[PDB]
Amino acid sequence: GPIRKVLLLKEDHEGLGISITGGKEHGVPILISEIHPGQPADRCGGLHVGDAILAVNGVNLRDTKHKEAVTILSQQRGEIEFEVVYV
């Protein structure tokens, strides 16, 4: 599919409201596994289960192990701009 850019806002006390799976050590992208009701991603729209997250706030996720991607995504605050593509 086409690559999309989607920005949401996250307050410091909030999570992103997504679950991810995949990663370099499993030979697949960082994939959105679930979008959780009522949390920032759900309230924004534009992210979808099965999207690959290619980058977040300009930080490349294409060659990251699962744990590293968790670290990177968890460290984003405020404006969070996702670069995603449906694989």
Binding site: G15, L16, I18, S19, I20, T21, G22, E25, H26, S33, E34, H36, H66, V70, L73, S74
Partner: peptide, 8 residues
């Protein structure tokens, strides 16, 4: 066991 889903 190794693939997991992580909530963030």
């Amino acid at each position: 066991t190794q693939n997991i889903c992580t909530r963030i």
